[PDB]
Amino acid sequence: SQIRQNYSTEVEAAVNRLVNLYLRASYTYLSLGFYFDRDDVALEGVCHFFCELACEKCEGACRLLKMQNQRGGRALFQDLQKPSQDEWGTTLDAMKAAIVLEKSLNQALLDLHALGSAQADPHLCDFLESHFLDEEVKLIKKMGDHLTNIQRLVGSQAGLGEYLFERLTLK
Amino acid sequence: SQIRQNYSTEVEAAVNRLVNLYLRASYTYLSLGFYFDRDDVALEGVCHFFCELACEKCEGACRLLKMQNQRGGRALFQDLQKPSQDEWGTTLDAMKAAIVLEKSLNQALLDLHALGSAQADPHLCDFLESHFLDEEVKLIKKMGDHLTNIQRLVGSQAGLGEYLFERLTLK
Amino acid sequence: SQIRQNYSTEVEAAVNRLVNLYLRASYTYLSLGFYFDRDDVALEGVCHFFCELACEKCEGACRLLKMQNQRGGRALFQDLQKPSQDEWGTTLDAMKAAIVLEKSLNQALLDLHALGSAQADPHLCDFLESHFLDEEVKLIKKMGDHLTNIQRLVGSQAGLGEYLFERLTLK
Amino acid sequence: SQIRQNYSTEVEAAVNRLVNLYLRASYTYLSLGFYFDRDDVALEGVCHFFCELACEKCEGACRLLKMQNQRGGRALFQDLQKPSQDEWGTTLDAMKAAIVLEKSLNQALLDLHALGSAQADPHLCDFLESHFLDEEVKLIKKMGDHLTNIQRLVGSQAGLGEYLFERLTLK
Ligand SMILES: [Cl-]
Numbered sequence: 001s002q003i004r005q006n007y008s009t010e011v012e013a014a015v016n017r018l019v020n021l022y023l024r025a026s027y028t029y030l031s032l033g034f035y036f037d038r039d040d041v042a043l044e045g046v047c048h049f050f051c052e053l054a055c056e057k058c059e060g061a062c063r064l065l066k067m068q069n070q071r072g073g074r075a076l077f078q079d080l081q082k083p084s085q086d087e088w089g090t091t092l093d094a095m096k097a098a099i100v101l102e103k104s105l106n107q108a109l110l111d112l113h114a115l116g117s118a119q120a121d122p123h124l125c126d127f128l129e130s131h132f133l134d135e136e137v138k139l140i141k142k143m144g145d146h147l148t149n150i151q152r153l154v155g156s157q158a159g160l161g162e163y164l165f166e167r168l169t170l171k
Numbered sequence: 172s173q174i175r176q177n178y179s180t181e182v183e184a185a186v187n188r189l190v191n192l193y194l195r196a197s198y199t200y201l202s203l204g205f206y207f208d209r210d211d212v213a214l215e216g217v218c219h220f221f222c223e224l225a226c227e228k229c230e231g232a233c234r235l236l237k238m239q240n241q242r243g244g245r246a247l248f249q250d251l252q253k254p255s256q257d258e259w260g261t262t263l264d265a266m267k268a269a270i271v272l273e274k275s276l277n278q279a280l281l282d283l284h285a286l287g288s289a290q291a292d293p294h295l296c297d298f299l300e301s302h303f304l305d306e307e308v309k310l311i312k313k314m315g316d317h318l319t320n321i322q323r324l325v326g327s328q329a330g331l332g333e334y335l336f337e338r339l340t341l342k
Numbered sequence: 343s344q345i346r347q348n349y350s351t352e353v354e355a356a357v358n359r360l361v362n363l364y365l366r367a368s369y370t371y372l373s374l375g376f377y378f379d380r381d382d383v384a385l386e387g388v389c390h391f392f393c394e395l396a397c398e399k400c401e402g403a404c405r406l407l408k409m410q411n412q413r414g415g416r417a418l419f420q421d422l423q424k425p426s427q428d429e430w431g432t433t434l435d436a437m438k439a440a441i442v443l444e445k446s447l448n449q450a451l452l453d454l455h456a457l458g459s460a461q462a463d464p465h466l467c468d469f470l471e472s473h474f475l476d477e478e479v480k481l482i483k484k485m486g487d488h489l490t491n492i493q494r495l496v497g498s499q500a501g502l503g504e505y506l507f508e509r510l511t512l513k
Numbered sequence: 514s515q516i517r518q519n520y521s522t523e524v525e526a527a528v529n530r531l532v533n534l535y536l537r538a539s540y541t542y543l544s545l546g547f548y549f550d551r552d553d554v555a556l557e558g559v560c561h562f563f564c565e566l567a568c569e570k571c572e573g574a575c576r577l578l579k580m581q582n583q584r585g586g587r588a589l590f591q592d593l594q595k596p597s598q599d600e601w602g603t604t605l606d607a608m609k610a611a612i613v614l615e616k617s618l619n620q621a622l623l624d625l626h627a628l629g630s631a632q633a634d635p636h637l638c639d640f641l642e643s644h645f646l647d648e649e650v651k652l653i654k655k656m657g658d659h660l661t662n663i664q665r666l667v668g669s670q671a672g673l674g675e676y677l678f679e680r681l682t683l684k
Pocket residue numbers: 081082421
């Protein structure tokens with residue numbers, strides 16, 4: 001590489017693995033989105049929430065791939081595993097699966113940051129802090145707020161609660 | 172006819188029968204609309220949903236009658252049967268009767284398309300695909316989404332659910 | 343299904359397979375796009391052409407998934423195979439791989455249309471004609487025009503030709 | 514100093530050396546700019562590219578000097594060595610000398626970041642990440658893209674290639 005400088009093979013490979021994780025997350029959210037569009041599920045605000053997250057995760061993948069080429073690394077794509085479920089249950093089940101997925105992405109970001117720290121790669125550490133770590137903390141906080149509101153609404157009238165959350169929060 | 176070309180007597184008669192079905196559907200929705208305007212029913216969003224569908228079905232009838240004259244067929248009107256009920260029950264009952272009515276219209280459209288295919292009438296087949304078959308699929312999907320949301324809201328507090336659906340979805 | 347009408351299990355499964363093909367094509371074009379962004383390839387107009395096609399194929403996947411739910415079918419996602427190459431060669435090599443990929447998508451569309459014809463599913467046949475078959479013919483024609491111009495420019499000065507095509511056609 | 518806090522003498526001196534490096538780089542690019550303005554070189558887009566970089570490096574010097582005073586360090590200026598050549602050859606030669614110069618600046622930035630890490634100076638580490646390390650990665654990537662395009666255009670008609678790159682990329 002004519003440009004590569006202070007860019008370890010370890011970080012280059014970890015960045016490719018992180019792109020895979022972000023594209024798998026995007027695929028998971030595409031499945032969640034279309035599940036909530038089923039005529040027998042029919043929660044449009046939940047459809048929109050997850051389709052928006054499919055787009056945001058594809059953006060994170062593309063940002064990583066841009067940075068890989070800016071550093072002189074080589075993008076390598078792997079197969080994208082299908083999402084973990086075909087049917088996603090209630091909005092509560094879906095939001096629980098989403099926060100588990102985002103905690104796994106956050107841990108992957110923190111692991112890559114630690115690798116960049118170990119490799120003395122301050123551009124990598126800046127890139128993640130600037131475009132990923134705060135976005136991920138913000139999203140996980142929003143999902144926790146949603147989980148608490150969804151849980152508050154179950155009580156003994158779960159259908160009513162699920163409708164109201166979709167109508168009055170995800171509108 | 173100076174203009175008629177590739178237009179079977181079978182399709183001409185089936186088009187007149189379809190006009191009757193669309194005008195009967197329009198009449199059914201006029202009855203549903205005014206039922207939800209009763210002072211002892213009083214669900215304005217449900218009134219508006221069905222009155223809108225009365226207008227849409229009259230538009231479909233008029234589109235068919237325009238096409239009948241464009242092809243050189245002769246419009247023939249029959250008596251319009253009164254709607255199947257005088258009182259329509261709950262919003263759930265009404266939406267169930269609506270989806271049954273729309274499935275019957277869709278089947279009539281598919282039967283006419285099959286006749287046009289059998290008669291090698293590609294203008295007829297184009298006309299239905301372009302102005303009816305996707306509109307009908309879209310409407311039946313919307314009605315299924317509404318049925319699922321209405322059913323979710325019954326639980327043990329049916330009046331509350333019926334109010335909320337009218338206020339928060341059909342607004 | 344409360345809504346499903348005239349929608350075969352055969353078409354439902356073929357639509358899921360077509361979604362997989364479109365998402366694999368989108369992934370292939372994401373790889374092509376980022377290959378042309380490498381500092382040792384550096385053809386921005388070729389980057390933009392393929393990244394645009396990644397977006398267009400994701401749109402086709404999403405249109406199919408929307409239609410699957412409008413018909414009352416169930417979206418089912420499979421693993422997404424990685425693209426067929428890690429490195430894509432010259433713009434000529436890349437455009438040849440793209441036209442092969444688009445001919446394979448077109449054949450899949452034609453196969454699904456034939457299935458819908460065999461199943462007497464005119465909504466499916468309309469949907470494909472309206473949103474896919476002409477878009478695919480148009481794209482394959484554009485790729486053929488590009489292949490001819492790329493081939494005209496090789497002569498004995500291939501680097502010069504590859505630069506000029508990127509600067510003067512894909513600008 | 515009434516203001517100085519957590520600011521090592523080692524970082525203060527390294528910042529003065531980095532200012533010298535940035536002003537020497539600015540001087541080098543002023544020479545490159547005016548070389549491409551010679552009547553017997555006459556490549557205006559190459560003139561503009563290097564004169565723009567002379568301005569950008571002077572901006573980096575001024576940013577460093579501002580930060581030195583914000584931290585309570587004392588700016589110290591040294592003689593500015595003349596650029597390494599009087600005549601810069603072809604656009605390829607010039608772009609090769611530029612990427613070598615920028616790799617040397619990047620290494621100086623990384624060395625200063627490592628010093629700030631060793632001295633536990635997070636303001637310094639933030640300052641460099643925020644205003645220098647990504648700008649430098651971006652510039653080196655652009656220069657690599659240019660080198661690849663310049664090299665593609667040499668073939669057996671070097672004058673033609675050099676003209677075309679200036680006209681169609683550096684316009
Ligand atoms: Cl799997």
